[PDB]
Motif scaffolding. Structure first.
Motif, PDB file in Angstrom:
ATOM      1  N   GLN E 125      33.204  36.324  31.705  1.00  0.00           N
ATOM      2  CA  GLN E 125      34.291  35.727  30.962  1.00  0.00           C
ATOM      3  C   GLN E 125      34.067  34.241  30.742  1.00  0.00           C
ATOM      4  OE1 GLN E 125      34.489  37.788  33.421  1.00  0.00           O
ATOM      5  NE2 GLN E 125      36.030  39.384  33.066  1.00  0.00           N
ATOM      6  N   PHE E 126      34.600  33.776  29.575  1.00  0.00           N
ATOM      7  CA  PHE E 126      34.597  32.407  29.212  1.00  0.00           C
ATOM      8  C   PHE E 126      36.053  31.987  28.885  1.00  0.00           C
ATOM      9  CE2 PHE E 126      32.412  28.635  27.517  1.00  0.00           C
ATOM     10  CZ  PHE E 126      33.445  28.075  26.790  1.00  0.00           C
ATOM     11  N   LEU E 127      36.588  30.847  29.529  1.00  0.00           N
ATOM     12  CA  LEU E 127      37.837  30.303  29.066  1.00  0.00           C
ATOM     13  C   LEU E 127      37.628  28.864  29.461  1.00  0.00           C
ATOM     14  CD1 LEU E 127      40.684  30.767  27.873  1.00  0.00           C
ATOM     15  CD2 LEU E 127      41.471  31.209  30.200  1.00  0.00           C
ATOM     16  N   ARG E 128      37.535  27.870  28.518  1.00  0.00           N
ATOM     17  CA  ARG E 128      37.181  26.494  28.773  1.00  0.00           C
ATOM     18  C   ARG E 128      37.934  25.640  27.806  1.00  0.00           C
ATOM     19  NH1 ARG E 128      30.562  26.735  29.711  1.00  0.00           N
ATOM     20  NH2 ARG E 128      30.601  28.229  31.455  1.00  0.00           N
ATOM     21  N   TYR E 129      38.377  24.465  28.275  1.00  0.00           N
ATOM     22  CA  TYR E 129      39.355  23.612  27.705  1.00  0.00           C
ATOM     23  C   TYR E 129      38.624  22.382  27.142  1.00  0.00           C
ATOM     24  CZ  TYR E 129      43.477  20.625  27.254  1.00  0.00           C
ATOM     25  OH  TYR E 129      44.464  19.795  26.774  1.00  0.00           O
ATOM     26  N   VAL E 130      39.146  21.750  26.060  1.00  0.00           N
ATOM     27  CA  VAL E 130      38.785  20.389  25.621  1.00  0.00           C
ATOM     28  C   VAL E 130      39.992  19.787  24.949  1.00  0.00           C
ATOM     29  CG1 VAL E 130      37.867  21.198  23.424  1.00  0.00           C
ATOM     30  CG2 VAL E 130      37.144  18.983  24.334  1.00  0.00           C
ATOM     31  N   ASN E 131      40.217  18.434  25.165  1.00  0.00           N
ATOM     32  CA  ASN E 131      41.258  17.707  24.466  1.00  0.00           C
ATOM     33  C   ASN E 131      40.810  16.392  23.870  1.00  0.00           C
ATOM     34  OD1 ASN E 131      41.043  15.919  26.585  1.00  0.00           O
ATOM     35  ND2 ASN E 131      42.925  16.598  27.609  1.00  0.00           N
ATOM     36  N   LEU E 132      41.676  15.648  23.101  1.00  0.00           N
ATOM     37  CA  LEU E 132      41.535  14.372  22.469  1.00  0.00           C
ATOM     38  C   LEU E 132      41.185  13.341  23.564  1.00  0.00           C
ATOM     39  CD1 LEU E 132      44.005  12.282  23.114  1.00  0.00           C
ATOM     40  CD2 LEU E 132      45.325  13.947  21.802  1.00  0.00           C
ATOM     41  N   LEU E 133      41.539  13.589  24.874  1.00  0.00           N
ATOM     42  CA  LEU E 133      41.403  12.642  25.995  1.00  0.00           C
ATOM     43  C   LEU E 133      39.989  12.794  26.518  1.00  0.00           C
ATOM     44  CD1 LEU E 133      44.857  13.156  27.767  1.00  0.00           C
ATOM     45  CD2 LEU E 133      44.184  11.302  26.236  1.00  0.00           C
ATOM     46  N   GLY E 134      39.255  13.898  26.229  1.00  0.00           N
ATOM     47  CA  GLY E 134      37.869  14.049  26.583  1.00  0.00           C
ATOM     48  C   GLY E 134      37.746  14.908  27.816  1.00  0.00           C
ATOM     49  N   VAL E 135      38.853  15.216  28.508  1.00  0.00           N
ATOM     50  CA  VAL E 135      38.856  15.989  29.744  1.00  0.00           C
ATOM     51  C   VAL E 135      38.720  17.402  29.451  1.00  0.00           C
ATOM     52  CG1 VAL E 135      40.167  16.636  31.790  1.00  0.00           C
ATOM     53  CG2 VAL E 135      40.221  14.272  30.975  1.00  0.00           C
ATOM     54  N   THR E 136      37.924  18.038  30.350  1.00  0.00           N
ATOM     55  CA  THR E 136      37.567  19.405  30.225  1.00  0.00           C
ATOM     56  C   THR E 136      37.631  20.006  31.544  1.00  0.00           C
ATOM     57  OG1 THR E 136      35.187  18.976  30.475  1.00  0.00           O
ATOM     58  CG2 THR E 136      36.095  18.880  28.255  1.00  0.00           C
ATOM     59  N   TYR E 137      38.002  21.300  31.530  1.00  0.00           N
ATOM     60  CA  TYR E 137      38.222  22.013  32.709  1.00  0.00           C
ATOM     61  C   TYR E 137      38.223  23.449  32.401  1.00  0.00           C
ATOM     62  CZ  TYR E 137      43.005  22.393  30.954  1.00  0.00           C
ATOM     63  OH  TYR E 137      44.115  22.657  30.186  1.00  0.00           O
ATOM     64  N   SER E 138      37.998  24.292  33.492  1.00  0.00           N
ATOM     65  CA  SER E 138      38.156  25.720  33.431  1.00  0.00           C
ATOM     66  C   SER E 138      39.121  26.126  34.496  1.00  0.00           C
ATOM     67  CB  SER E 138      36.805  26.416  33.598  1.00  0.00           C
ATOM     68  OG  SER E 138      35.930  26.095  32.530  1.00  0.00           O
ATOM     69  N   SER E 139      39.935  27.147  34.144  1.00  0.00           N
ATOM     70  CA  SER E 139      40.928  27.670  35.032  1.00  0.00           C
ATOM     71  C   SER E 139      41.118  29.134  34.463  1.00  0.00           C
ATOM     72  CB  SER E 139      42.184  26.796  35.005  1.00  0.00           C
ATOM     73  OG  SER E 139      43.172  27.297  35.890  1.00  0.00           O
ATOM     74  N   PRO E 140      41.645  30.077  35.203  1.00  0.00           N
ATOM     75  CA  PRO E 140      41.848  31.485  34.768  1.00  0.00           C
ATOM     76  C   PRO E 140      42.855  31.593  33.729  1.00  0.00           C
ATOM     77  CG  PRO E 140      42.891  31.133  36.890  1.00  0.00           C
ATOM     78  CD  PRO E 140      42.097  29.888  36.608  1.00  0.00           C
ATOM     79  N   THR E 141      43.718  30.622  33.574  1.00  0.00           N
ATOM     80  CA  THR E 141      44.759  30.641  32.612  1.00  0.00           C
ATOM     81  C   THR E 141      44.611  29.184  32.086  1.00  0.00           C
ATOM     82  OG1 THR E 141      47.122  31.067  32.237  1.00  0.00           O
ATOM     83  CG2 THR E 141      46.519  29.928  34.261  1.00  0.00           C
ATOM     84  N   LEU E 142      44.791  29.061  30.778  1.00  0.00           N
ATOM     85  CA  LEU E 142      44.772  27.745  30.176  1.00  0.00           C
ATOM     86  C   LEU E 142      45.798  27.928  29.049  1.00  0.00           C
ATOM     87  CD1 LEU E 142      40.912  27.110  30.221  1.00  0.00           C
ATOM     88  CD2 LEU E 142      42.613  26.104  31.749  1.00  0.00           C
ATOM     89  N   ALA E 143      46.518  26.803  28.752  1.00  0.00           N
ATOM     90  CA  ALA E 143      47.450  26.792  27.596  1.00  0.00           C
ATOM     91  C   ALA E 143      47.566  25.314  27.139  1.00  0.00           C
ATOM     92  CB  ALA E 143      48.791  27.389  27.990  1.00  0.00           C
ATOM     93  N   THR E 144      47.832  25.095  25.778  1.00  0.00           N
ATOM     94  CA  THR E 144      47.891  23.774  25.263  1.00  0.00           C
ATOM     95  C   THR E 144      49.301  23.512  24.872  1.00  0.00           C
ATOM     96  OG1 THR E 144      47.332  24.450  22.996  1.00  0.00           O
ATOM     97  CG2 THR E 144      45.510  23.941  24.473  1.00  0.00           C
ATOM     98  N   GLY E 145      49.685  22.182  24.647  1.00  0.00           N
ATOM     99  CA  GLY E 145      50.943  21.756  24.153  1.00  0.00           C
ATOM    100  C   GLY E 145      52.131  22.186  24.926  1.00  0.00           C
ATOM    101  N   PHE E 146      53.194  22.578  24.199  1.00  0.00           N
ATOM    102  CA  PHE E 146      54.434  23.167  24.785  1.00  0.00           C
ATOM    103  C   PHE E 146      54.147  24.386  25.661  1.00  0.00           C
ATOM    104  CE2 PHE E 146      58.032  26.121  24.627  1.00  0.00           C
ATOM    105  CZ  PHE E 146      59.034  25.332  25.126  1.00  0.00           C
ATOM    106  N   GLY E 147      53.193  25.224  25.246  1.00  0.00           N
ATOM    107  CA  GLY E 147      52.749  26.351  26.122  1.00  0.00           C
ATOM    108  C   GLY E 147      52.061  25.904  27.427  1.00  0.00           C
ATOM    109  N   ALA E 148      51.504  24.666  27.457  1.00  0.00           N
ATOM    110  CA  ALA E 148      50.891  24.120  28.629  1.00  0.00           C
ATOM    111  C   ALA E 148      51.983  23.839  29.682  1.00  0.00           C
ATOM    112  CB  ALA E 148      50.120  22.855  28.284  1.00  0.00           C
ATOM    113  N   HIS E 149      53.152  23.502  29.167  1.00  0.00           N
ATOM    114  CA  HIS E 149      54.310  23.254  29.957  1.00  0.00           C
ATOM    115  C   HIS E 149      54.937  24.524  30.422  1.00  0.00           C
ATOM    116  CE1 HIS E 149      53.864  19.336  27.909  1.00  0.00           C
ATOM    117  NE2 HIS E 149      54.504  18.768  28.914  1.00  0.00           N
ATOM    118  N   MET E 150      55.100  25.513  29.551  1.00  0.00           N
ATOM    119  CA  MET E 150      56.150  26.502  29.789  1.00  0.00           C
ATOM    120  C   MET E 150      55.493  27.824  30.118  1.00  0.00           C
ATOM    121  SD  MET E 150      58.967  24.921  29.655  1.00  0.00           S
ATOM    122  CE  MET E 150      60.131  26.282  29.623  1.00  0.00           C
ATOM    123  N   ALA E 151      54.402  28.159  29.342  1.00  0.00           N
ATOM    124  CA  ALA E 151      53.797  29.525  29.386  1.00  0.00           C
ATOM    125  C   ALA E 151      52.941  29.761  30.540  1.00  0.00           C
ATOM    126  CB  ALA E 151      52.989  29.788  28.125  1.00  0.00           C
TER     127      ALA E 151
END
Lengths: 250, 233, 223, 205, 233, 204, 245, 243, 206
Positions: E125-151
């Protein structure tokens, strides 16, 4: 991957002569007849307009160009060289004496820019001289009326009458005799037309003849009859009809 | 005549190829002989290194370009450095930009363009050095032949250097045998030594002369040099 | 200033007032606001004095260069486009509010240009500090079947409205009639309607109150 | 922006129907509160079959459309006639690349005979979005309900002129930076028809 | 220096024991006006990776062209075996993140936050994150924006560690994904009714369900009305 | 500190009949402290006189640019520059230095020596061309100076009478300032003799 | 000699310089490529020579893609051919970004066309020794173009270049005329295989591997694929029934 | 220097070898062309020879549409013809944006001329041999026909022809023009001009043409179009019933 | 090929001379004569106008006499065309010393800048050198009158009387006898003219 070439195309020869320039002296000779007469009271330049197909027109050709309004120029040599040079010459005259000044350029000073351009092209490889020699005829208020000659090297000299094109020496010799001292601009037109008649044969029409004077600036040449705000042309081309009247009058 | 078509690189001749390309081609052969063989899981290069003298010693001509990528040369040492530097930058970028280990096919095509470009000038020149570029990525092991003309062919075994043909005919024979020896570092090394000896006919086969290089299913780019080839002779 | 342009069915009139001010004090009763670009493309300019004049000479040059090059008349639309591309590069750094007018063989035309970078085409247009009062006259009294006499007469009225109600405007009015059919007429000081700021008279100075610490002469020379 | 306040009618739309597309806009430039122009062109030709409606700031839009006119004059000549979507890309490039200095809201509207009319809306930031009809300017928001019910795929030419005539005349009635004549441009296979309706006419109908 | 003028919201994703699921509404906001609905946020890249983008639509169209270039150049110089050496999740991730990281470092930023999801055809499996801030990370669950908060807290209950992974089958995972989105549509209005849902299966590859709309609706709240903003004179 | 009013200075030019006159102070200050009673703010190249007031560093750099431009032009044409031509040369040089951060007020004065006209012409901070021939003023106290010139000046005056005008006009405007004391000079120009008269005036 | 055997910097009385003549030759010493236009598509085919047993099938293929719908195949020199497509790819990619459209086939032709013309007016930049046959399907229809070392291009119905160019064109004009255009994309593959066969007689000293590809609207749906598997074997078999040389 | 057979300079005879040979081969496409002006229109009729039946005719053109109103006929070899077309079309497009106005025949002519003269001096770059005939129906001077040659020369025409049968066409034109004493055909409707043109062509090259052997382009007020096969056939048909 | 058009004529010979330079020395002998006399009271400059028609004007006598500065002038032997390029660059060279230090340029420096430039073209650039000699007449209050000459090789020397052009040798031989340590301008005017009459390649003198 190119534009690494700058070795000259004009070199010294063992007679210290310049190869291209000898070649170009011929080109002038293979031209057609053009003359200049300075009457002191103006300048008249005339040439033969001739063309290279019967279906072409020489009424819709031009061999005198306006360089700036008050100055017109003519040549003997090759058509292509003349067109690119006139364009570059028209460019520098506007940029450097109407953005840095506002008075239209004195004549001699304009000659020095044309000369610098032609010599520059002779020094530097990857360009070759222009194959042409000009008579640039103008007027300026602080000089009066003027006539300059520019040679294909880039050299200049003033003359009060000169001739170029086929039978150059013999045309010029004819002027020396028929015109002495100071005579009129009008009278000098009558003479210029005769001189041009004797060089040429097989065309005698005013639709193949172009004669222009620098000798008056009218509101009619200003494009407005209001109060002046600029000098405007002192250049005026005489009409095909106008030319025709005067041939009858010889 | 001759001097027309050697003295310019932005020319062509009546044959369908310029003379300078014929001389560059000759120059690969002027290299010392090296064979390359693969079964498509592992790829080996076995190379005979000559040194100038008894008072010279060997200097490297098998080049680690990455820990999964390398080359051998045959031909001109000066040129070989220029090419190796290029392939190395190219390997690095492939990792940084794409997370790739670089396929030979992609690398070859890029090396080609630069070469082409320097025949598109005066005072640039073909390299005149050939390379057998190996690497182990995800489509397996690979062996490419690069030539400074820009001809890129993938071969299952090949040779470049003087008397290429000796190993090459041995290779076309043993072919079917080696491609079904899959998964073995040691069987293939042994083959390489056997191969290089069918090239030889005016040169000696000695421990210090010979040099082996491997990359493969379970081997990142590791070289056996000097002493460490004795046990495969 | 008050600059205007008015179309008639035979030509175009532009006109301007010629007063330059430093405070309420009249520096110049005369400076041209009407600039010649070519004999029949005249341009009126308003706003900052230095900017309108310089831009008008750069363009003025590039258009004349053009006319000789093509061996044909210059078009008004060439002058227009040069003006727009120049404003655009400099993003508004040029502060020229221009009224560009011209007659060509294509007909009579009337456009205006803001320093902001927008151009417009109008039947009559005005710009200036006198812009509101003048545009008011021009829209009301403009009519179909306009003619030369009517177009001059309207043009006089315009400049005058701006003189009267903007008192930073004043002094002579210069008018320029550009006809398609006949050779354009620049009318310098067509009206002489207002005068200089206040004087009380002045008189001769007695020489027992004007004194000289020392003096010499010198001379102008040129080699 | 470029310099100062330049503003336009701020109500444009392009609508699709049985024969092509009709684009409509109102025409009026104001510079502050002074009426810089009664009647103008916000229906701008960039190709013979491809026009645009301009919204945003008048200056900005005019520079950007000039540049567009230049790229498609060249595209046509070398690479052949362009799509609505192609015209739309050139707009987008400019808008995106200069969002930090210019504001341009473009509806690119085009008629093609082999895919019919197409309507592409370009945001202030620069984006390319396909719809069957679009409304833009800022008076588009009050006629959103109207446009969405009374738009239908397939209508007659007279009828589309009523729908666009009704829509904009409401927008101009509530909006205060709008006025002057209503212009339309009908791009059909019957040619390019330019429609003008004068103040008294649209108010009434 | 960029000032957001448009937003897209919400990409939520998770891993299950045999794949990953990712879902996202389709959205082009102009603040609170749902200007565009038909702006895809899930751009499938090949048939084993989905690139999910939230954030600014203006940056998103630029990237949309680069993601299409990424497919194209990977067929260049690699004609075959394009699922063993092309269009791998790690590559897609790496490509995008280098352009992102460079744009933010020079103050002209790519204002997105991105999830790259897949099942590697070379890996698991592949699930990998990137943002405007340059930070990257992997976690079993990832969500962006409002879903990063709530979902994501809902999703973390499903998988948050290797031990929790065997305990999530196809059925449970797809149920979680559907539940999460509905929470997003309910408590944030920026989210569109319309969504896309993609499952990237270790056996089935990419199965993409288009033009879905949220269902099993909440309307329960209307029962408990007392007012909350209503005035009385 | 101040943009151009560190050292101050004011300049006056007048028209007459075959004469013009141009006058200046000699102040140089460092803030409101007057430092020097000498500093010549008017220069000339032949029969064209250029006064430039304002900040001294900027008057000096310009003065050397126009000297250069004129010298090399003189050399090519084999004659001096004309008042009329020099005004053209100035507009453009200044429009080149509008973008640069200069702080100047030039005023151009001369008599045409083959057209036979008195000639004066003005220039500003913006560098716009001012065609008028009566008086033109520039400098710090330009506001006081226009009020004064406009009442005191009367058209067309002989050199003696032009002197009485220019001198008093300057002296009384100057007396309402501290940035225009520290001595003053007046130049009365005909194109074949120049008289220099120093005035005696106030300082702080 | 005339001095124009090593200069591109001057005009020659053959209308073209000898060094351009020398590049054309190099095209004729490569190995046969054709192009078959169809009523729904285009078909590309190539001969690759097998000399040695060491070669691997379909990785040394001289057919290269541009984009995903444009097929390019060439005959002559290998380094020149790769350089050419590599330039085409950059310019295509530039087009795709700028106008947000796939490239037209007549547009791609120009884009190459100016680059190929440019190195014949320059002495310092080497001519191409390849003739490239290219085409695809686009939004104007399907198009087959072929580009020469000259910078010459025109639209074709069938096209050929390489050693067997004469023989191949002869068979091709006959078949293309006898049909409307070589019927449909499926039919054309069998015919194509027969041409590659006949052409091998001009080369019968070394063996071949037939390698075919397509981009067809109605039988590949707008994408470029190689033609392989069951279908490629089938086509050799069909050829060996009728021709038995 | 010392070279003139590897680089381009002035001859001492004065007739430049590179310019002369450029005058000569252009004819390597098997073309012959003319353009005439009618009172209101400008028509070009041009030959086409198709050398294979693997070739479509409808992609074979020697007329390139520069803008919307401007036409250009190139007589030359086609890689050089096209090279000039690409350059001309952009310069035209650039002018149109900058100056708000559609490019003149003569100005396009002049600009490409001055550039070829520049390449003639250049010792690292060669001149195109192309002969370019620029035509349109300007409204600021009427119909116009202006021809350039690779030298840098250009001049105005009454009608023109190019190809080796230049002389034969010339004579046909001279005869007509002497008789009417006019430099144009005054025939109202373009149609009658195209047919006349076609007659004179049939006389000069002395063969009857087909739809696929001519390609006809006509310039009209504010628009330029090439004429189709089916229309070309109408012209050939209609002159068969004058005798 | 680019270097297959090159001839390398800008390099040292097997005799160690520079082809193009030697050819330029020749040029100067086929142009008019120029003579420079320095006296301690003035400097007298003459340059000979060859090919004089009657329709050539005699209202110009600035066309081989050029003021480079308002205390420095030259007489040209060579072409108008070669000279003009250097003349503009000289005049500029003048203004630079003038603007910076607010005083007149020294002659000895100004000469050096021209010679270095001539020298430059034949070393690097692949260029022709200029075919021109200058005789420099200028004044300093650190040296009195100075008179220099520069020639096509980039070599320059000082002279207190000098000749260049046709018949250099002969003029110089006459000059060496008639020269005297004592000077005046009007005496120098007579001296120049006596010589000029005897160096003309045409009968008498006008």
């Amino acid at each position: 991957m190119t534009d690494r070439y700058s070795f000259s195309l004009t070199t010294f020869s063992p007679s210290g002569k310049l190869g291209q320039i000898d070649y170009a002296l011929t080109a002038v000779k293979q031209g057609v007849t053009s003359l200049g007469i300075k009457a002191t009271n103006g300048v008249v330049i005339a040439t033969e307009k001739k063309s290279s197909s019967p279906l072409a027109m020489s009424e819709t050709l031009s061999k005198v160009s306006l360089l700036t309004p008050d100055i017109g120029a003519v040549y003997s040599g090759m058509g292509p060289d003349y067109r690119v040079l006139v364009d570059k010459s028209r460019k520098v005259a506007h940029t450097s004496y109407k953005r840095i000044y506002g008075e239209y350029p004195p004549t001699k000073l304009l000659v020095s820019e044309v000369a610098k351009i032609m010599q520059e092209a002779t020094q530097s490889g990857g360009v070759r001289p222009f194959g042409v020699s000009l008579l640039i005829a103008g007027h300026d208020e602080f000089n009066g009326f003027s006539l300059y000659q520019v040679d294909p090297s880039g050299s200049y000299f003033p003359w009060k009458a000169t001739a170029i094109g086929k039978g150059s020496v013999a045309a010029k010799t004819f002027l020396e005799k028929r015109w002495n001292d100071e005579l009129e601009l009008e009278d000098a037109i009558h003479i210029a037309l005769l001189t041009l008649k004797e060089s040429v044969e097989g065309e005698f029409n005013g639709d193949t003849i172009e004669l222009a004077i620098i000798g008056d600036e009218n509101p009619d040449l200003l494009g407005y009859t209001g109060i002046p705000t600029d000098k405007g042309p002192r250049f005026r081309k005489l009409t095909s009809q106008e030319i025709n009247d005067r041939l009858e009058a010889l | 005549f001759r001097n027309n078509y050697d003295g310019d690189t932005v020319t062509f001749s009546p044959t369908g190829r310029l003379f300078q390309v014929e001389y560059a081609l000759e120059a690969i052969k002027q290299g010392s002989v090296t064979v390359g063989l693969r079964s498509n899981t592992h790829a080996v290069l076995v190379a005979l290194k000559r040194n100038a003298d008894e008072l010279s010693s060997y200097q490297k001509k098998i080049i680690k370009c990455d820990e999964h990528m390398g080359l051998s040369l045959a031909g001109l040492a000066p040129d070989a450095r220029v090419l190796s530097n290029y392939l190395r930058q190219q390997c690095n970028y492939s990792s940084l930009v794409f997370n790739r280990k670089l396929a030979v096919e992609r690398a070859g095509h890029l090396l080609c363009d630069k070469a082409q470009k320097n025949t598109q000038s005066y005072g640039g020149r073909p390299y005149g050095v050939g390379l057998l570029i190996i690497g182990y990525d995800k489509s397996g092991a690979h062996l490419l032949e690069f030539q400074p003309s820009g001809n890129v062919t993938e071969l299952y075994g090949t040779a470049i250097g003087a008397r290429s043909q000796g190993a090459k005919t041995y290779l076309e024979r043993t072919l079917d045998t080696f491609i079904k020896i899959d998964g073995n570092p040691d069987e293939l090394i042994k083959a390489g030594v056997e191969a290089i000896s069918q090239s030889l006919r005016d040169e000696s086969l000695t421990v210090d002369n010979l040099s082996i290089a491997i990359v493969g299913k379970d081997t990142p780019f590791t070289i056996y040099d000097g002493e460490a080839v004795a046990k495969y002779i | 200033t008050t600059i205007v342009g008015v179309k008639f069915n035979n030509g175009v009139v532009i006109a301007a007032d010629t007063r330059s001010t430093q405070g309420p004090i009249v520096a110049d009763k005369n400076c041209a606001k009407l600039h010649r670009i070519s004999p029949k493309i005249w341009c009126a300019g308003a706003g900052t004095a230095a900017d309108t004049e310089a831009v008008t000479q750069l363009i003025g040059s590039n258009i004349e260069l053009h006319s000789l090059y093509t061996s044909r008349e210059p078009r008004v639309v060439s002058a227009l486009q040069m003006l727009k591309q120049h404003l655009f590069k400099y993003q508004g750094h040029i502060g020229a509010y221009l009224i560009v007018a011209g007659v060509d063989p294509t007909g009579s035309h009337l456009f205006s240009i803001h320093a902001h970078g927008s151009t417009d085409v109008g039947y009559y247009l005005s710009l200036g500090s006198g812009s509101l009062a003048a545009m008011a006259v021009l829209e009301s009294h403009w009519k179909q079947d306009l003619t030369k006499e009517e177009a001059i007469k309207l043009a006089s009225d315009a400049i005058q409205a701006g003189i009267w109600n903007d008192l930073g405007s004043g002094s002579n009015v210069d008018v320029c009639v550009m006809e398609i059919g006949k050779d354009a007429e620049y009318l310098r000081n067509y009206l002489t309607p207002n005068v200089r700021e206040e004087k009380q008279k002045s008189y001769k100075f007695p020489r027992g109150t004007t004194a000289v610490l020392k003096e010499s002469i010198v001379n102008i020379c040129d080699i | 922006l470029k310099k100062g306040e330049v503003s336009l009618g701020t109500s444009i739309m392009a609508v699709t129907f049985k024969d092509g597309v009709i684009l409509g806009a109102d025409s009026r430039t104001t510079t502050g509160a002074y009426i810089a122009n009664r009647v103008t062109d916000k229906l701008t030709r960039v190709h013979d079959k491809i026009w645009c409606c301009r919204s945003g700031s008048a200056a900005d839009t005019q520079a950007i459309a000039d540049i567009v006119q230049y790229h498609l004059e060249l595209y046509t000549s070398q690479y052949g006639t362009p799509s609505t979507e192609t015209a739309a890309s050139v707009f987008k490039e400019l808008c995106y690349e200069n969002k930090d200095n210019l504001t341009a809201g473009i509806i690119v509207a085009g008629y093609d005979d082999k895919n019919k009319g197409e309507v592409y809306t370009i945001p202030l930031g620069g984006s390319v979005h396909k719809l069957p009809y679009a409304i833009a300017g800022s008076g588009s928001t009050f006629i959103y309900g109207y446009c969405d019910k009374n738009f239908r795929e397939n209508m007659s030419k007279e009828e589309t002129v009523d729908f666009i005539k009704h829509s904009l005349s409401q927008a101009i009635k509530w909006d205060g930076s709008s006025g002057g004549v209503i212009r339309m441009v009908v791009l059909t296979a019957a040619g390019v028809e330019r429609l003008i309706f004068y103040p008294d006419e649209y108010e009434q109908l | 220096t960029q000032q957001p003028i448009v937003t897209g919201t919400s990409v939520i994703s998770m891993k299950y024991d045999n794949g990953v699921i990712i879902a996202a509404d389709n959205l082009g906001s102009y603040g609170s006006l749902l200007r565009f609905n038909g702006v895809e946020r899930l751009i499938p890249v090949g048939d084993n990776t989905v690139v999910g983008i939230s954030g600014d639509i203006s940056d998103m169209q630029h990237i949309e062209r680069l993601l299409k270039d990424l497919v194209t150049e990977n067929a260049y110089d690699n004609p075959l075996a394009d699922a063993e050496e092309a269009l791998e999740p790690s590559y897609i991730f790496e490509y995008l993140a280098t352009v992102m990281y460079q744009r933010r470092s020079k103050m002209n930023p790519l204002w997105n936050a991105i999830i790259v999801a897949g099942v590697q055809s070379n890996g698991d499996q592949f699930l990998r994150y990137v943002n405007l801030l340059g930070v990257t990370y992997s976690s079993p669950t990832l969500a962006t924006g409002f879903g990063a908060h709530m979902a994501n807290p809902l999703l973390r209950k499903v998988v948050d560690r290797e031990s929790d992974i065997p305990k999530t089958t196809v059925q449970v995972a797809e149920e979680a994904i559907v539940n999460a989105m509905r929470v997003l549509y309910y408590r944030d209005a920026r989210s569109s009714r319309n969504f896309s849902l993609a499952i990237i299966d270790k056996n089935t590859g990419l199965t993409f369900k288009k033009n879905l709309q949220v269902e099993n609706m909440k309307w329960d709240f209307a029962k408990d009305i007392k007012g909350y903003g209503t005035q009385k004179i | 500190s101040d943009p151009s009013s560190i050292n101050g200075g004011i300049v006056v030019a007048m028209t007459g009949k075959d004469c013009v006159a141009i006058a200046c102070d000699l102040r140089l200050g460092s803030q409101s402290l007057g430092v020097s009673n000498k500093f010549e703010k008017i220069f000339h190249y032949g029969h064209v006189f250029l006064g430039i007031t304002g900040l001294a560093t900027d008057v000096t750099t310009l003065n050397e640019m126009f000297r250069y431009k004129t010298n090399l032009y003189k050399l090519k044409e084999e004659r001096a520059i004309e008042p009329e031509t020099f005004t053209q040369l100035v507009s453009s040089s200044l429009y080149e230095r509008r973008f640069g951060p200069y702080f100047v007020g030039p005023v151009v004065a001369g008599i045409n020596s083959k057209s036979g006209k008195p000639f004066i012409a003005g220039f500003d901070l913006i560098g716009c061309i001012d065609e008028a021939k009566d008086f033109i003023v520039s400098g710090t106290a330009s506001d006081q100076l226009f009020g004064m010139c406009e009442s005191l000046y009367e058209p067309n005056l002989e050199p003696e009478d032009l002197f009485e005008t220019i001198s008093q006009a300057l002296l009384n405007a100057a007396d309402r300032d501290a940035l225009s004391g520290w001595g003053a000079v007046v130049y009365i120009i005909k194109k074949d003799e120049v008289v220099k008269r120093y005035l005696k005036m106030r300082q702080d | 000699g005339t001095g124009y055997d090593l200069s591109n910097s001057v005009f020659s009385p053959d209308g073209r310089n000898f060094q351009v003549e020398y590049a054309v030759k190099a095209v004729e010493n490569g190995t046969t490529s054709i192009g078959i236009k169809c009523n729904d598509g285009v078909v590309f085919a190539v001969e690759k020579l097998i000399t040695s047993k060491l070669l691997v099938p379909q990785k040394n293929v001289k057919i290269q893609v541009v984009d995903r719908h444009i097929g390019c195949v060439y005959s002559g020199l290998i380094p020149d051919g790769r350089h050419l497509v590599n330039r085409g790819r950059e310019e295509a990619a530039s087009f795709k970004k700028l106008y947000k459209t796939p490239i037209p086939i007549p547009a791609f032709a120009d884009r190459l066309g100016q680059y190929v013309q440019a190195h014949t007016l320059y002495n310092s930049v080497r001519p191409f020794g390849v003739s490239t046959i290219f085409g695809g399907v686009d939004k104007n229809g399907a198009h087959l173009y072929m580009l020469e070392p000259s910078g010459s291009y025109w639209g074709y119905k069938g096209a050929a270049t390489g050693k067997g160019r004469q023989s191949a064109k002869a068979e091709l004009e006959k078949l293309v005329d006898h049909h409307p255009e070589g019927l449909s994309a499926r039919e054309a593959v069998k015919q194509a295989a027969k041409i590659i066969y006949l052409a091998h007689e001009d080369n019968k000293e070394k063996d071949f591997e037939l390698e075919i590809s397509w981009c067809s609207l109605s039988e590949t749906n707008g994408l470029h694929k190689f033609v392989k598997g069951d279908l490629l074997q089938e086509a050799i078999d069909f050829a060996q029934k009728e021709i038995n040389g | 220097a010392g070279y003139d057979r590897h680089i381009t300079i002035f001859s001492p005879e004065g007739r430049l070898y590179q310019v002369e040979y450029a005058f000569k081969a252009t004819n390597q496409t098997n073309i012959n062309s003319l353009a005439v002006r009618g009172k209101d229109c400008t028509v070009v009729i041009s030959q086409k020879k198709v050398p294979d039946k693997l070739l479509d005719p409808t992609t074979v053109s020697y007329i390139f549409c520069i803008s919307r109103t401007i036409g250009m006929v190139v007589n030359g070899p086609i890689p050089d013809a096209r090279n000039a077309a690409l350059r001309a079309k952009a310069e035209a497009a650039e002018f149109r944006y900058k100056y708000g106005y559609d490019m003149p025949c003569d100005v396009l002519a002049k600009r490409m001329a001055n550039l070829s003269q520049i390449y003639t001096q250049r010792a690292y770059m060669r001149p195109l041999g192309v002969i370019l005939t620029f035509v349109s129906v300007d409204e600021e001077l009427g119909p116009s026909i202006y021809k350039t040659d690779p030298a840098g020369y250009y001049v105005g025409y009454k009608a023109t022809a190019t190809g080796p049968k230049q002389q034969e066409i010339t004579t046909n034109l001279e005869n007509h023009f002497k008789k009417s004493k006019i430099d144009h055909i005054n025939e109202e409707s373009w149609e009658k001009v195209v047919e006349f043109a076609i007659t004179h062509m049939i006389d000069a090259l002395g063969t009857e043409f087909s739809k696929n052997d001519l390609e006809v382009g006509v310039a009209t007020k504010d628009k330029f179009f090439t004429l189709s096969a089916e229309n070309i056939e109408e012209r050939l048909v209609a002159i068969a019933e004058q005798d | 090929g680019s270097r297959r058009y090159d001839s390398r004529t800008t390099i040292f010979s097997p005799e160690g001379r520079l082809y193009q330079v030697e050819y330029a020395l020749e040029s100067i002998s086929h142009a008019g004569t120029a003579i420079g006399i320095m006296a301690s009271d003035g400097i007298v400059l003459a340059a000979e106008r060859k090919v004089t028609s009657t329709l050539l004007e005699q209202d110009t006598s600035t066309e081989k006499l050029y003021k480079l500065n308002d205390k420095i002038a030259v007489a040209v032997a060579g072409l108008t065309a070669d000279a003009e390029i250097l003349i503009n660059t000289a005049r500029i060279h003048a203004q630079n010393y003038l603007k910076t230090y607010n005083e007149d340029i020294p002659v000895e420096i100004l000469v050096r800048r021209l010679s270095d430039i001539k020298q430059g073209y034949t070393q690097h650039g692949g260029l022709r050198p200029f075919g021109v000699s200058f005789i420099y007449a200028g004044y300093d209050d650190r040296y009195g009158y100075q008179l220099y000459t520069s020639n096509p090789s980039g070599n320059y020397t000082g002279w207190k009387a000098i000749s260049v052009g046709a018949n250099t040798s002969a003029a110089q031989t006459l000059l060496q006898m008639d020269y005297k340590d004592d000077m005046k301008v009007d005496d120098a005017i007579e001296l120049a003219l006596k010589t000029l009459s005897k160096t003309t390649d045409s009968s008498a003198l006008t």
